[PDB]
Amino acid sequence: HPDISVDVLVIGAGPTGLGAAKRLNQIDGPSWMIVDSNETPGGLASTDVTPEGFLYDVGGHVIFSHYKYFDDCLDEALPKEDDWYTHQRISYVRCQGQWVPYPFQNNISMLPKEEQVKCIDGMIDAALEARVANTKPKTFDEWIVRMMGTGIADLFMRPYNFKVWAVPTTKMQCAWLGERVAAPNLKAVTTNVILGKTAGNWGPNATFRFPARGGTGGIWIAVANTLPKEKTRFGEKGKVTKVNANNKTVTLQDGTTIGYKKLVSTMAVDFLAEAMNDQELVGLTKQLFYSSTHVIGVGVRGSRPERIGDKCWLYFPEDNCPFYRATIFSNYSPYNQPEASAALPTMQLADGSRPQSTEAKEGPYWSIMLEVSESSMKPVNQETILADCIQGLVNTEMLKPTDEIVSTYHRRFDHGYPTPTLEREGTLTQILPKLQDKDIWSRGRFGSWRYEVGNQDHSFMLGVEAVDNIVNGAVELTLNYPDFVNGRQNTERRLVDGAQVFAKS
Amino acid sequence: HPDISVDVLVIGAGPTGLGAAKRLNQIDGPSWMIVDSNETPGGLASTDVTPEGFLYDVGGHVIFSHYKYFDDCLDEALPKEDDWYTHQRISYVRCQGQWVPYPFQNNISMLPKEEQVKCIDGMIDAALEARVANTKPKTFDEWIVRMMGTGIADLFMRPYNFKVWAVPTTKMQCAWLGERVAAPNLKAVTTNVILGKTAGNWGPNATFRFPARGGTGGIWIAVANTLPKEKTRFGEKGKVTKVNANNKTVTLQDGTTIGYKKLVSTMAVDFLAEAMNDQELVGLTKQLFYSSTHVIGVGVRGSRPERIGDKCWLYFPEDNCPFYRATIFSNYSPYNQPEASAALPTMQLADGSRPQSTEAKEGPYWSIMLEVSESSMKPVNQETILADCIQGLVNTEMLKPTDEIVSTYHRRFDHGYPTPTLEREGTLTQILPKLQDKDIWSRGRFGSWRYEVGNQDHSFMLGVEAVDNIVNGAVELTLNYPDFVNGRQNTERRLVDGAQVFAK
Amino acid sequence: HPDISVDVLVIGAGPTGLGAAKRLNQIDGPSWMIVDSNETPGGLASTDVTPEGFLYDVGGHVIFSHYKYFDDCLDEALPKEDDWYTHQRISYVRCQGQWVPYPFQNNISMLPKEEQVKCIDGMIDAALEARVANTKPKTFDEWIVRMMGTGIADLFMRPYNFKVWAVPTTKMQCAWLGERVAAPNLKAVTTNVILGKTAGNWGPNATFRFPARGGTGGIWIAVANTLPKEKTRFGEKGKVTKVNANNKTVTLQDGTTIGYKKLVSTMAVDFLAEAMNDQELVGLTKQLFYSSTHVIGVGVRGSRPERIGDKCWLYFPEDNCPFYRATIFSNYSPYNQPEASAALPTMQLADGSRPQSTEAKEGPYWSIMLEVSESSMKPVNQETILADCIQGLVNTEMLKPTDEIVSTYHRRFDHGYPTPTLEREGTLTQILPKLQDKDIWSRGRFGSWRYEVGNQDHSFMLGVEAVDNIVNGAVELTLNYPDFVNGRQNTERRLVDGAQVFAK
Amino acid sequence: HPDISVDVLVIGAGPTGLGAAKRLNQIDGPSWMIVDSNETPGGLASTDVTPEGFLYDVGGHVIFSHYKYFDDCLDEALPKEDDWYTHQRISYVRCQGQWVPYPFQNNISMLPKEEQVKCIDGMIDAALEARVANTKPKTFDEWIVRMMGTGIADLFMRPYNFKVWAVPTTKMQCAWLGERVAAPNLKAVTTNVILGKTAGNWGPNATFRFPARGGTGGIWIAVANTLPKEKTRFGEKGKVTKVNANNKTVTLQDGTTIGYKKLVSTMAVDFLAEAMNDQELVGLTKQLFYSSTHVIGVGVRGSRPERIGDKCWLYFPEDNCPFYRATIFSNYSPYNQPEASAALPTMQLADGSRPQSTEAKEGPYWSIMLEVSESSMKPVNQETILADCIQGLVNTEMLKPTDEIVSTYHRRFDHGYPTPTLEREGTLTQILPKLQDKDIWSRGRFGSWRYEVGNQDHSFMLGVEAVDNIVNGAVELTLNYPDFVNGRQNTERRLVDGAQVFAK
């Protein structure tokens, strides 16, 4: 008999595990327990802070919720109106010395005329081909070129996606992008070129909310806090080392054994296979491809520069900088960096030179967060990446050579992005049924390895739906039908359902 | 304070209400109650019997299940292997003196060659057009011509569908038919013509199961039997006469009042509106269109004729008979008609004449079930419809003039088919949400009026999913995404879920 | 026995008839003569002069030669270098206050950005439709929209062409436009829009040459001058009044009879039918359609305005003026109007006011030539059309209100354009072969009624090829295959062929 | 000064040179002479005879005339109705043991069903592709697959054309096939399949006429006989050995020199270049591809076998025989072989064995004429080809092993077909204008090297038109616009034109 026994054991307390736990706790039927090897819940949705007081998420983290249930839990966790800040979804593509409003194709009036001609000519070819198309695109690359035409694809989506995924667009699938037909909106694009007009895809109703304090990681701490503490086990005490799927027993690092009837595993599925000592699953899961993420944070002295303005996130297809995306994290919340009266010495100037004075001075401060990808196809020199990113900041005109840097941050995350390669589904449809046959619901960004349902809200719901499948026979819609859950507002499932209402009387 | 109070009240004990009841009874959380004006549950999935012992369902009833939950409840209700008979899904189209295996277009090799030419030419036009199509069809008719071409459409789907829906194909939407692109499989059609082959869409894996006894109605009586009797109110005592949506109170015919928190109503939504005395809802529901169904049953003396054989259901596009579909109901089960030893006099010959003898004679017996549609666009002479059907049976060579008829059945069901008119959705998206905001889940063949999810399994699951939405925040998938539930095996929800397992 | 007998009689001495005559004269085999009711040859390619000394062609006449034969004869007729002026083919469309270089679609960068959007959107639609099109356009209108899209069609080709043809574009065929597929060059149009480029279809190698003196009429007088006079009969003496096709006899105004073996008739075919007293043919020819042309000329005091510059011809789609086309005729030759030292009083200002001073002042002078169409579907008030045109010149900013007009000209030509109606070919198929069988070669702008081969060179060659068919069994290529002759440099036939070289 | 001088010198008295001569003789203007290395006029349109009396053309020669002028000259040459025989254009494709009527695709009902399925499926692919095609095919091969689809292309046109051209279909252009859009008539093909119908493209309307005597060679002998003898120089005396283009002098075998103003050369343009000793042209003409033709004749004892019947010519795509085409030459005229009473010994049986008796026996007789192509890409063993052809006849069931062969004929023609390779035009547009600059009209099957205008009627007209260009400035339409001349009835040019009528 094992040290402790529950009906449903949840491994991991990132958004996915927390979702499983939130639904288990709501149902309050079967006994359950959630473990995590980290004392702080949140997983990849956590937040670090430098010794100098600059918070950084694990790269740009921006919530768009497809589910009311997710909204219910965020609201419960952070209920005050000043627990959040609201911003418009402002993004740009850095291209040939310009900040081009997203979406790129609707804004190429900013490029030289000769290049506009090439772009439009390419999209004309794409529109004429789309008119007689009778096949679906088979690769990400085909999808890109059919949507954009060659000239536009070459400027942004092709080089950008390589810098993101660290694999060529020709080696990726495109089903994950959804069911929308790959075809240009030629009229929209030429209309903006003719009018000499720019237009981003944001406005008063295209907004997101960011937590006032603690960064994204604050959300999950708050959510976790709403669970019964005695049913949680976070820290070294909660680190799983072995899973005997046959005995439905899990062994933690401190030797504790847990018996379960159903397992919800949100750890990376390749780590699960190793922990199960299953050679067959180990074999299969090493067929899955992923990239690592280097997050670099740069704290800068001064009020926010006019040139940065209200920008939120930014895309970098060009090769004059190593990052694919930058986030003006200081725009998300004034509490993401020290207040103006806090004193910090300048560490270096943006151009790498030493400051004239070593003395500590006041702010105000602003803050840039950058992401660099790494794969077996795209190596990252960890000893020079910070300095190279900072050089990239000068090259892209985000910093002047003279800008004062008061804080740096660099961290490498081994499992960053699960790759939508051509082979992914072929591999997943062998792995998941084998785990399912053992009453193991492997779910999450790396639990189920599906980027298209790999955001915070998706992950959370993957955990919720896993519990709902386990207990109520619910369809696991997010897991199996990304296009379905993404094409609708999911209003039916709520933090308070009829069940708990009727029970309370 | 009303006479009774329950958390969830279910109106109607046809397949839909029974689904609601079964899910409620499984969850066993909220209190609930199910009422019906009929002593026998089943609704349009019931079975009648003539005084001579011939059973008849409400027209051809053949189950194809999309849901394990449904199978679970059917197995629970009728657990024995001898409770069921298995049959292949054998259907034909009567056309120009021949029985053409379904699907029609794959079997036009049976028609005269000149006609095959016309058919193939039309489908060639449809293929070339589909090659450059970039719009979806907007009407049932357009959908048909794009799938089949003009020649084929005119031979079967066009005239047949008018006989079924009792409204022209140009007046119906086509979304209900699924997301599949409207375009011909030219190669499969020409291949069969070239090889001179016929081929039905059945075989050892395209089967269905039919209850050994009591006809389709027997399923629902047995499913109803698994419910706690004290939670059911069936008969005149359970006939709903008034619904007060404001006070969440229902009043039965015998004056009984029932308070509810949530209402699952499976009666026809136009009847519900009337019971609510809600004049706005009455106006909206009057915008919906439906056809009535005449079910005609004919019991015949003799061993099953070889010309009939293993046929199960049959389609009739042509003018020489008023029915759109016939079912050889005696093939579905030997208990659908009297044993051979049963003595019965001949009532008439199939040509309409009086029999030579009035003496009761033995069988064996076989049995034909026919359906005729009626609507405001397609009236039917009620007084002659039986005799017209019988003459139709002679015209199509299903009966010989000399065949001996020993039993007849005819019943008109006012609400037969909810019609997928062009207008249906615009009207429903006004009705269903308005009812929803009053905490009324109106669901089922006429409860929510969507034929594409209007079979027994769909109906049953509409009831299940309505309860599951009310209690467990489930998505009402069947109701809102026909294409979704119909395109997969719905395996997740079972009669015993983790919930009930952990409970013990 | 008739007064005169020749092998080949040529009726009419405009370009077509003179073509016939030049070929007959070069071959110098069969006997022949040529008649015309006018003393001065040239037909609709003649030139008038006002009492004030301003020349006017019969509307805008610009030669583009598709044939070396035609060149040879023009060079023979006018061999001196200073017999000609050369100009670039500079044309513009007047639109929304702007002179838009031709071709219009390549120059819409001159219009407001909002107009450009509408034009490009329209042309995108046409490009996507052209990608799947598998029929040819049936009407001029279809052809226009397929080529240009709606937005561009509506700004220029549609309204302009109604103003020209005096019938709606929907009533005309489109084969006469040639064999090019009706489809937009979307890339070329969008590229010029993107670059903000304008670009005319002219330059150092897109030129025309114009006669130094006598206007276009000078060419035909001089070509006619190369024929032997005794084979000509021009004036009242040569007016044909009767054609007896069966007796191969023609009667002149003065009673002279001329017998012929072959007849080349270049007068309007409807006139020919009347002269033939052939009611079958009168009936048929009356089915053809044509428009009348009002040629208005305006002589203006002053040096050529900068706003006018080197413009040659100009198109006017808009309804702020009655003319469809203006020509800056004073740009074609300095001898189209008086010398600067010539004194002329001002007849009126462009604003319509007439000054009290009759003082004759000197020049220099410039000149505008205008055309207004008339037909049964578009009447023209002959009494006001001059003043309306002049006000149109003010509306389009060709003239200032204060400009001083020193000469006016207005003449109506009954047969102006032979219209390419939908019915034209059907009707000509009944007419031309009927005449052919009577040994009558009816040819020319109204002789054979085909506008696409109705220019001076085409006409000339229709006459040449008629003779060549009569004498040498040549194919009448220009008559039957406009697309053929228009798509190549016709170099083979020359004023001096091998036959004449060897004969020496 | 040269031994003899003329305005126009014609080299070669095949159809092309004879066409030039006929027109010169008719015009009777410039002086002229025609020479040939062969005492008998006709070139590749001549006829041989075996010692046993069996006539053979240079392969199957069947006249389809596109020109009235050609008809005129043939009718002049052989004016009696009994100078000609008329036959329907009857042809078949030998495929998988069947004689499939031409055109092949309309008759695939004769093939096994599973193969019909493959053919139709391929043509369906081609039809759907043609529906969205926006390019012209670039190779003969692409043109074939677009017309026929893969399956049909593979059975006939692909393998057959390799056997004809002795180069792959992928190495040939396709413009020579005309302007017709490359697309299948899918309905025509499916219809005959569905109906199980076969039908050739012949009937009482589709006929040809063949000379009663002397084979095709007899036409040209008779036409040449209409020329003034004194203006012809045929035989060893007429063999051109040198051409001095600069001096405009030709040198014959016997040393005679002829001066000309204009040269119409109908010899192979590669031999012309050699005779001109022009190294630039010799290099260019060596870039032209051509195949050699082997003609095999087989005379057989017996009345015409039923299996052969009224067949005229036959196509052989398959590898079980070396010939690409066979002609039942004995069907063209009873005078193409000895009369029945003529006695001839049997030379061998079809299976190659000796006859039982070596004595002469009577007919009747019939006759097969066969064509085998040869090129650098496809060698022919000259020593075994006769035997291989005869075996092919047995393999194709044209001869029984027992049939008695009474005559054999074999002859190799080095210049057989001028090949429409991808490069042909690039080369010819360099060669022809250079010759044209030296007043040399190089014209004919190998004179101008264009197969699509390489028949007897085209060749004749190439010469006629060459003269007409030289003397009358006519356009050379046949030479430059094959599609134009082949798409019309050319009725204008006659053996007696107006010119000759007016002269008398």
Closest to C385 measured CA to CA, from C300, C297, C318, C290: C297
Cis amide leading into C51 (omega within 30): no
**Pairing of the two strands C91-95 and C98-101:** antiparallel
Residue B2 lies in a domain: no
- Say if residues A89 and A202 touch (Cβ distance below 8 Å): yes
> Within B168-291, where are the H helices?
186-195, 217-225, 269-275, 279-285
- Say if residues D16 and D467 touch (Cβ distance below 8 Å): no
The nearest CA of chain C is from the CA of D7 a distance in Å of 7
Sign of CA dihedral D71, D77, D80, D85: negative
Kindly identify which residue of chain A lies nearest to residue C109, measuring between CA atoms. Answer: A194
Q: Is A495 on the interface with B (CB under 8 A)?
A: no
From CA C298, how far away is CA C320, in angstroms rounded?
A: 18
Partner-chain residue, chosen from A120, A128, A196, that has the shortest CB–CB distance to C127:
A128
Q: With DSSP H G I counted as helix, E B as strand and the rest as coil, what are the percentages for chain C, rounded to 5?
A: 40, 25, 40
Rg of chain D (C-alpha set)? 24
Residue reference for tokens 């011939």: B54
Put simply, the chain C residues between 254 and 313 with a CB less than 8 A from any chain D CB are: 261-262
Residue reference for tokens 């082959």: B197
- Alpha-carbon separation of residue C405 from A436, C57, C353, C366 (angstroms): 97, 19, 10, 10
CB contact set of D93 (below 8 Å; sequence gap of 6+): D99, D100, D101, D102, D104, D156, D160, D314, D315, D316, D317
Both tokens of A4, joined, read: 């402790």
Both tokens of A46, joined, read: 């956590």
From CA D298, how far away is CA D387, in angstroms rounded?
A: 11
Q: Is residue A240 annotated as involved in ligand binding?
A: yes
- Say if residues A266 and A14 touch (Cβ distance below 8 Å): yes
Residue D478 lies in a domain: yes
Which residue of A124, A193, A194, A197 is the best one to mutate when testing the C interface, meaning the one whose CB has the most C CBs within 10 A? Answer: A194
3 state DSSP class of C459: helix
- Say if residues C219 and C333 touch (Cβ distance below 8 Å): no
Question: Number of CB pairs < 8 Å for B and D?
Answer: 52
The nearest CA of chain A is from the CA of C195 a distance in Å of 6
For residue C117, the chain A residues in CB contact (below 8 A) are 191, 194-195
Residue D119 lies in a domain: yes
- The DSSP-derived string for C103-128 is SGGGGGGGS-HHHHHHHHHHHHHHHH
Using what technique was this structure determined?
X-ray
The nearest CA of chain A is from the CA of C117 a distance in Å of 6
From CA D133, how far away is CA B414, in angstroms rounded?
A: 55
Q: Which domain holds residue C371?
A: 7-504
3 state DSSP class of B261: strand
Cβ contact B113–D190 (<8 Å): no
CA C260 and chain centroid, separation? 30
Q: Is residue A160 annotated as involved in ligand binding?
A: yes
From CA B35, how far away is CA B240, in angstroms rounded?
A: 8
Q: How many CA atoms lie within 13 A of C157 on its CB side?
A: 21
Q: Is residue A315 annotated as involved in ligand binding?
A: yes
- Alpha-carbon separation of residue C115 from A194, C122, C222 (angstroms): 10, 11, 49
Angle between helices D217-224 and D15-27 (to 10 degrees): 30
- Alpha-carbon separation of residue D41 from C165, D222, D233, D256 (angstroms): 59, 9, 10, 20
Kindly identify which residue of chain A lies nearest to residue C197, measuring between CA atoms. Answer: A113
CB contact set of C41 (below 8 Å; sequence gap of 6+): C13, C14, C18, C220, C221, C223, C224, C234
**Pairing of the two strands C84-88 and C207-211:** antiparallel
Which partners does chain B have (≥3 C-beta pairs < 8 Å)?
Answer: A, D
Cβ contact D127–B128 (<8 Å): yes
Q: Which helix (H) or strand (E) holds C141?
A: helix C140-148
Kindly identify which residue of chain A lies nearest to residue C188, measuring between CA atoms. Answer: A121
From CA C61, how far away is CA C67, in angstroms rounded?
A: 17
- The DSSP-derived string for B343-391 is -EE--EETTSPPPS--SEE---EEEEEEEEEEBTTB---TTTHHHHHHH
Partner-chain residue, chosen from B7, B474, B503, that has the shortest CB–CB distance to A474:
B474
Cis amide leading into A204 (omega within 30): no
Cβ contact B497–A471 (<8 Å): yes
Put simply, the chain C residues between 101 and 160 with a CB less than 8 A from any chain A CB are: 113, 116-117, 120-121, 124, 127-128, 131-132
Angle between helices B217-225 and B68-77 (to 10 degrees): 80
Both tokens of A193, joined, read: 């070129």
- Counting other chains too, the contacts that A286-289 makes at CB distance below 8 Å and 24 or more residues apart are A287/A423, A287/A427, A288/A418, A288/A419, A288/A424, A288/A427, A288/A428, A288/A431, A288/A449, A289/A167, A289/A375, A289/A418, A289/A419, A289/A421, A289/A423, A289/A424
From CA D147, how far away is CA B213, in angstroms rounded?
A: 62
Spell out where chain B is interrupted, by the residue before each break (C to N > 2.5 A): none
Kindly identify which residue of chain A lies nearest to residue C122, measuring between CA atoms. Answer: A187
Closest to D338 measured CA to CA, from D372, D299, D309: D299
Judged by phi (left if over 0) then psi (alpha if -120 to 50, else beta), residue A338 lies in beta
3 state DSSP class of C384: coil
Burial C407-418 (b: 16+ CB within 10 A, else e): bbbbeebebbbb
Residue C130 burial (CB count, 10 A) = 19
> Within D149-259, where are the H helices?
150-155, 157-165, 186-195, 217-224
- Say if residues C59 and C65 touch (Cβ distance below 8 Å): no
Residue A1 lies in a domain: no
**Pairing of the two strands A365-374 and A404-418:** unpaired
From CA B458, how far away is CA B462, in angstroms rounded?
A: 6
- Say if residues A476 and A442 touch (Cβ distance below 8 Å): no
Both tokens of B482, joined, read: 């026909």
From CA D491, how far away is CA C154, in angstroms rounded?
A: 45
CB contact set of D501 (below 8 Å; sequence gap of 6+): none
Q: Which helix (H) or strand (E) holds D413?
A: strand D404-418
> Within B47-156, where are the H helices?
68-77, 113-131, 140-155
CB contact set of C46 (below 8 Å; sequence gap of 6+): C14, C38, C40, C57, C58, C216, C217, C220
**Pairing of the two strands D91-95 and C313-315:** unpaired
From CA C327, how far away is CA C393, in angstroms rounded?
A: 12
- The CA-to-CA distance between both ends of chain D, in Å, stands at 36
For residue A113, the chain C residues in CB contact (below 8 A) are 194-196
Residue A2 lies in a domain: no
Cβ contact C471–D29 (<8 Å): no
Q: Which amino acid type is present at position B348?
A: Q
Residue reference for tokens 């304090």: A213
Q: How many CA atoms lie within 13 A of D100 on its CB side?
A: 25
Q: Is D51 on the interface with B (CB under 8 A)?
A: no
For residue C151, the chain A residues in CB contact (below 8 A) are none
Residue D226 burial (CB count, 10 A) = 14
Both tokens of C72, joined, read: 């040879």
Q: Is residue C61 annotated as involved in ligand binding?
A: yes
From CA C463, how far away is CA C82, in angstroms rounded?
A: 28
From CA A450, how far away is CA A458, in angstroms rounded?
A: 10
Which residue of D492, D494, D496, D504 is the best one to mutate when testing the C interface, meaning the one whose CB has the most C CBs within 10 A? Answer: D492
Query: Looking at residue D28, which CATH number applies to its domain?
Result: 3.50.50.60
3 state DSSP class of D221: helix
Residue C311 lies in a domain: yes
φ and ψ at B272, to 5 degrees?
-60, -45
- Say if residues B242 and B39 touch (Cβ distance below 8 Å): no
3 state DSSP class of A243: strand
Q: Is residue D417 annotated as involved in ligand binding?
A: yes
- Say if residues D424 and D34 touch (Cβ distance below 8 Å): no
Q: Is residue C411 annotated as involved in ligand binding?
A: no
Kindly identify which residue of chain D lies nearest to residue B125, measuring between CA atoms. Answer: D187
From CA C223, how far away is CA C51, in angstroms rounded?
A: 26
Closest to D169 measured CA to CA, from D422, D408, D461, D500: D422
Cβ contact C472–D131 (<8 Å): no
Closest to D338 measured CA to CA, from D316, D309, D360: D360
Q: Is A69 on the interface with B (CB under 8 A)?
A: yes
- Alpha-carbon separation of residue A349 from A49, A336, A342, B283, D139 (angstroms): 21, 21, 19, 75, 66
Residue reference for tokens 């022009």: D278
Name residue B99's beta-bridge partners. B94
* DSSP for residue D61: -
The nearest CA of chain D is from the CA of B134 a distance in Å of 13
Angle between helices C68-77 and C456-472 (to 10 degrees): 110
- The CA-to-CA distance between both ends of chain A, in Å, stands at 38
CB contact set of A279 (below 8 Å; sequence gap of 6+): none
Q: Is D188 on the interface with B (CB under 8 A)?
A: no
CA D362, D367, D368: angle at the middle one, nearest 5?
A: 150
- The CA-to-CA distance between both ends of chain C, in Å, stands at 36
Cβ contact B262–A498 (<8 Å): yes
CB contact set of C177 (below 8 Å; sequence gap of 6+): C140, C143, C452
- Say if residues D293 and D165 touch (Cβ distance below 8 Å): no
From CA C402, how far away is CA D243, in angstroms rounded?
A: 77
- Say if residues C149 and C143 touch (Cβ distance below 8 Å): no
- Say if residues C338 and C300 touch (Cβ distance below 8 Å): no
Q: How many CA atoms lie within 13 A of B57 on its CB side?
A: 27
φ and ψ at B18, to 5 degrees?
-60, -40
For residue C132, the chain D residues in CB contact (below 8 A) are 132
The nearest CA of chain D is from the CA of C7 a distance in Å of 7
Q: Is residue C451 annotated as involved in ligand binding?
A: yes
Both tokens of B192, joined, read: 């069969």
* DSSP for residue C404: E
From CA D443, how far away is CA D292, in angstroms rounded?
A: 20
- Say if residues A110 and A98 touch (Cβ distance below 8 Å): yes
Q: Which residues of B does the annotation place in the binding site?
A: 16, 36, 44, 59-61, 66, 89, 91, 102, 105, 157, 160-161, 165, 180, 201, 205, 240, 313, 315, 325, 417, 445, 451, 454-456, 458-459
- Say if residues A485 and A68 touch (Cβ distance below 8 Å): no
CB contact set of A168 (below 8 Å; sequence gap of 6+): A141, A162
Residue D285 lies in a domain: yes
Partner-chain residue, chosen from C473, C476, C499, that has the shortest CB–CB distance to D497:
C473
- Alpha-carbon separation of residue A63 from A66, A209, A233, A418, A444 (angstroms): 10, 7, 27, 19, 16
Kindly identify which residue of chain B lies nearest to residue A466, measuring between CA atoms. Answer: B492
Residue reference for tokens 């209007």: B454
Residue C219 lies in a domain: yes
- The DSSP-derived string for B287-304 is T--EEEEEEEEEEEESSP
For residue D261, the chain C residues in CB contact (below 8 A) are 502
Partner-chain residue, chosen from C134, C261, C474, that has the shortest CB–CB distance to D474:
C474
For this entry, resolution in Å reads 2.2
From CA A405, how far away is CA A351, in angstroms rounded?
A: 10
Closest to C215 measured CA to CA, from C76, C307, C342, C327: C327
Cβ contact A113–C195 (<8 Å): yes
Judged by phi (left if over 0) then psi (alpha if -120 to 50, else beta), residue C186 lies in alpha
Cβ contact A127–C128 (<8 Å): yes
Cβ contact A493–B474 (<8 Å): yes
From CA B73, how far away is CA B495, in angstroms rounded?
A: 7
Length of chain A: 505
Both tokens of A327, joined, read: 């986030």
Q: Which helix (H) or strand (E) holds B311?
A: none
The nearest CA of chain A is from the CA of C395 a distance in Å of 30
From CA B335, how far away is CA B341, in angstroms rounded?
A: 13
Kindly identify which residue of chain B lies nearest to residue A505, measuring between CA atoms. Answer: B30
The nearest CA of chain B is from the CA of D117 a distance in Å of 6
Residue C501 burial (CB count, 10 A) = 14
From CA A48, how far away is CA A54, in angstroms rounded?
A: 8
State how many domains chain A has.
1
Closest to B452 measured CA to CA, from B428, B492, B418: B418
CB contact set of D225 (below 8 Å; sequence gap of 6+): D77
Cβ contact B471–A498 (<8 Å): yes
- Counting other chains too, the contacts that A468-471 makes at CB distance below 8 Å and 24 or more residues apart are A468/A23, A468/A493, A468/B472, A469/A441, A469/B492, A470/A8, A470/A30, A470/A262, A470/A264, A470/A441, A470/B498, A471/A27, A471/A29, A471/A30, A471/B497, A471/B498, A471/B499, A471/B502
